[PDB]
Amino acid sequence: KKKKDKWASLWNWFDITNWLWYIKLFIMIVGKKKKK
Numbered sequence: 001k002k003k004k005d006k007w008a009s010l011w012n013w014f015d016i017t018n019w020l021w022y023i024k025l026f027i028m029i030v031g032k033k034k035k036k
Contacts, residue, residue, distance in 0.1 A: 001009055 003009075
């Protein structure tokens, strides 16, 4: 966000964009497999 290169920061956010979607399903798969 801050500092020079405003696009550079947004370019990195790309990977994070889907990352947030992976961290959700990931934990969902781990818990399930954990079973009761």
